[PDB]
Amino acid sequence: STGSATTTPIDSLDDAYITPVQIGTPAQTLNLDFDTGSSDLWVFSSETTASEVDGQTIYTPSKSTTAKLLSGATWSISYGDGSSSSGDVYTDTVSVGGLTVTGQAVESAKKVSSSFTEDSTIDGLLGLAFSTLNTVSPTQQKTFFDNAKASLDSPVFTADLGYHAPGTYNFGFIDTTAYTGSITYTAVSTKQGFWEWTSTGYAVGSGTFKSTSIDGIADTGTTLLYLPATVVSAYWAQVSGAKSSSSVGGYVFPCSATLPSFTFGVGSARIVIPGDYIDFGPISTGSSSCFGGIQSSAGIGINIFGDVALKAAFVVFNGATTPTLGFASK
């Protein structure tokens, strides 16, 4: 089998991407944030505290003839930005772009943090990291990809995110029309449960390429590119007036600037992030200070190749027995 679904930016900045997902019988369609950095499929629901729902579409298990309570199971998650959610668990039929999994754990939120309530465009998350990170207790549950894998034509999914435009998530096949050149594959460590890999270096603008190993994760659920402070300083030093602001929480730059590109290495290959992809706009409405799309990872504990980087490539998440990542230009 295969599946193919369109993913759409939630706003004019590409802050996140939403993909429609069918849950239950008859189908209830929710717009989920596909997150290769976590491993829980959770949704706003009829069980969510009413004061914490503000515009989201909810899953109602009592209206699904295929929903079954997973008795005794609970879940609770906190993300890298401090957002969180928790609740109980049902199994139900879940379909993405024509690909159907029966018996998928659908984690129903009883509580969500204010950051989720305040974003009416995201109805929940669909995790695509390794199932060892799933938070369901006392019986850990499998991701949608892990459940689907054996049925897929090939044990892979691909992320093709657009810049200010829709893109695609495919399951079970490589669309050879969706990229240019060849795909370069690189090794993955699953030791922390992430799609963790080692970039071979970077360049700023037209500058020379610096060969240096940068360990990090391919994370579709993170907006920005988070890298070591040395690398990030070298980038922003090429933008007149750019500075790190403690009050704002990162590097800012004059909105009048033209930003240089940023290149990262994948083996001997190179992915070029255009400068425009690094512009996240005024820090507040009407400000002439703009927020940068490359930020320091120093406070996180891991480097994160988030959407800023991934949207510059066609990315293969190869879930074969020895997992690998592939990157191509597009």
Ligand SMILES: O[C@@H]1CNC[C@@H]1Oc1ccccc1
């Ligand atoms: O802050 C934004 C609005 N609600 C939270 C959202 O960011 C996240 C998206 C996915 C995972 C964690 C956080």
Ligand SMILES: O[C@@H]1CNC[C@@H]1Oc1ccccc1
């Ligand atoms: O819904 C609102 C529109 N822009 C802000 C908020 O959502 C998000 C902000 C940051 C990351 C993910 C989502």
